[PDB]
Amino acid sequence: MKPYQRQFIEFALSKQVLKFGEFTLKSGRKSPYFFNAGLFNTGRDLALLGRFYAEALVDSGIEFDLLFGPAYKGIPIATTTAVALAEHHDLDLPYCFNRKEAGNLVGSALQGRVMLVDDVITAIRESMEIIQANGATLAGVLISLDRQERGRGEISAIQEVERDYNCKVISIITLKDLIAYLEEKPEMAEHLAAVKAYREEFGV
Amino acid sequence: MKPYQRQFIEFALSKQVLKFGEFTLKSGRKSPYFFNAGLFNTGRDLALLGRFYAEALVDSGIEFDLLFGPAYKGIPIATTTAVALAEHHDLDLPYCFNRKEAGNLVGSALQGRVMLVDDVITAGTAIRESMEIIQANGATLAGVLISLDRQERGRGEISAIQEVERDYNCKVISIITLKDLIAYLEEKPEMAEHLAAVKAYREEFGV
Numbered sequence: 001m002k003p004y005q006r007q008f009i010e011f012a013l014s015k016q017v018l019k020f021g022e023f024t025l026k027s028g029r030k031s032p033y034f035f036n037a038g039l040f041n042t043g044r045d046l047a048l049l050g051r052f053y054a055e056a057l058v059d060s061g062i063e064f065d066l067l068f069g070p071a072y073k074g075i076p077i078a079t080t081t082a083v084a085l086a087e088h089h090d091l092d093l094p095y096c097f098n099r100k101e102a103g104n105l106v107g108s109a110l111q112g113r114v115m116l117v118d119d120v121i122t123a124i125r126e127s128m129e130i131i132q133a134n135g136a137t138l139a140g141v142l143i144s145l146d147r148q149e150r151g152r153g154e155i156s157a158i159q160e161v162e163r164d165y166n167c168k169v170i171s172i173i174t175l176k177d178l179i180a181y182l183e184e185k186p187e188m189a190e191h192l193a194a195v196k197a198y199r200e201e202f203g204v
Numbered sequence: 205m206k207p208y209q210r211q212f213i214e215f216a217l218s219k220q221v222l223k224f225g226e227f228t229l230k231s232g233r234k235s236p237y238f239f240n241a242g243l244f245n246t247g248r249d250l251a252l253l254g255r256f257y258a259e260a261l262v263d264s265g266i267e268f269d270l271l272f273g274p275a276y277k278g279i280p281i282a283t284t285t286a287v288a289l290a291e292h293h294d295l296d297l298p299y300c301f302n303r304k305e306a307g308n309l310v311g312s313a314l315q316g317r318v319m320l321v322d323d324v325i326t327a328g329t330a331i332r333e334s335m336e337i338i339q340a341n342g343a344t345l346a347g348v349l350i351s352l353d354r355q356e357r358g359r360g361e362i363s364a365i366q367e368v369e370r371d372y373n374c375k376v377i378s379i380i381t382l383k384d385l386i387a388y389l390e391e392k393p394e395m396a397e398h399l400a401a402v403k404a405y406r407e408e409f410g411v
Contacts, residue, residue: 041312043271043286044296050287067247072279072303072310079283082247083254087291092248099276100304106276108245 001177004055008144008172009181011048015039018178020191026122027152029202032194033178035145037073037119050080051088053117056142056172057081058089064139065112069097070127074118081117098130105130113139120144121157121169128165138167146171149202156204175199205384208259212379213388215256219249222385224398231359233409236401237385239352241323242277254284257321258293260379261285261349268346269316273301274334278322285321307337314338317346325350325376327358327367335372345374352385353378356409363411382406 012018016039023034040049057064067085069078075097085091094108114136116127120143131138141161146169151157158169179199182192216222220243227238244253261268271289273282279301289295298312318338325331325348338345348368353376358364365376386406389399 038310041300042296042298043288043290046283046299047287047290072275072301075276075279076283076299076301079250079280080287083251083284083287084247086247086251092246094246095250095280096245097276097280106242106280 001173001180002055002059004052004059005173005177006181008052009178011052012037015045020182020188020195032191032198035120035147037144046076046080047084049077050082050084052172053077053081053142053144054084054089056170057085057115058091060140060142060170062115062140062168062170063113064115065094066108066110066114066136067093067095068110068114068116068127068131069095070116070118070123071098071100072123074116074123074127077117077119098127100126105134110134110136113137115139116141118143121161124161138165140167141169142171143169144172146174148175148204149199150204154204159204175203205380205387206263208256208263209380209384210388212256213385215252219243224395224402236398236405239324239354241351250280250284251288253281254286254288255292256379257281257285257349257351258288260377261289261319262293262295264347264349264377266319266347266375266377267317268319269298270312270314270318270343271297271299272314272318272320272334272338273299274320274322274330275302275304278320278334281321281323302334302337307333307340309337309341314341315343317344319346320348321350322348323351325368326364327371331368331372335374345372347375347377350376350378351380353381355382355411356406357411361411366411382410 017037019034023031025031067078067082069075078095082093082095085093096107096110098104114131162169182188222239224237227235229235271282271286273279282299286297286299289297300311300314302309353365355363358367369376389395
């Protein structure tokens with residue numbers, strides 16, 4: 001994997017954003033790992049989070065004119081990603097985010113090719129409606145982890161977003177990266193087996 | 205003024221946040237200048253803005269445990285200020301913000317001495333909302349930090365910042381004040397007409 005992907009995994013583990021064990025997802029599915037970015041809740045966590053998103057954006061090669069953060073979780077993420085692009089990649093991007101009621105936008109004018117940044121896709125439909133109503137284009141959606149598993153139907157929730165809004169979704173890391181990481185850790189052999197078994201049953 | 209205050213004024217001028225001209229405020233007053241912090245609307249703007257807030261906070265000497273940003277405009281301000289404190293001041297601070305309606309909170313637990321950060325303020329429903337949340341959670345308000353204190357009368361005899369302070373016995377600090385804008389305009393011949401207009405406005409409305 002790329003260095004920023006390895007570092008993001010280690011960062012998430014250290015803050016217990018990423019945890020391996022026996023969990024139940026929103027759906028009710030039994031899952032061998034959990035990812036919850038809410039525990040990125042200090043200035044240092046925010047600083048690093050923005051650098052990871054910024055590195056994933058530059059790595060993707062996608063062209064975009066504006067960074068959009070969905071209310072509410074997307075607002076700090078877009079802010080720190082925009083800072084990191086300016087400080088560490090010499091890229092000065094307009095940013096924008098929505099209010100859930102009234103206009104309904106904060107930041108730069110919503111125009112051009114829009115990169116949406118958010119924590120996960122299991123807020124997004126609401127922000128997509130705003131981007132379309134303003135006549136802007138979707139350059140992409142960047143989230144932290146692509147779990148690469150079926151949603152309620154046969155395709156993943158990410159694939160459903162891609163289909164419904166004709167946009168590419170990219171991620172900082174994927175389930176494949178988690179598995180590659182766990183292969184290097186002998187003490188995590190038990191978790192690796194459980195993750196591979198989960199992928200066999202629910203993976204796409 | 206301190207160097208970071210002069211640099212903040214230069215920054216606001218460069219991004220058209222600070223404009224000298226003819227304007228009408230929300231109160232109908234006719235002002236010789238306007239300050240619209242919403243025009244700090246790019247990543248580089250956000251990066252620098254956080255660094256100026258962080259410098260004003262450290263320079264204040266006020267001790268605090270958590271940064272709170274009121275929804276919505278305070279959320280990016282608290283975020284970039286927290287980033288700047290961690291990256292440029294070796295200070296790793298919890299942050300928190302509210303959701304406007306179902307208080308409903310995002311981030312670290314709301315407790316300890318809270319520094320509220322926003323772009324501007326005024327005694328009213330918005331600020332009273334943030335303060336009730338802070339007190340409801342059993343936290344202490346260490347202060348409020350804003351970008352510019354216009355130092356002009358509200359509808360009473362005190363300024364909007366004094367209203368917030370005197371009505372709620374809290375400390376408000378600012379990156380710059382009207383006094384600093386006047387000091388910046390001095391001995392710049394190309395701004396002489398604006399200096400006189402600002403000074404005239406202050407004589408009429410300044411507190």
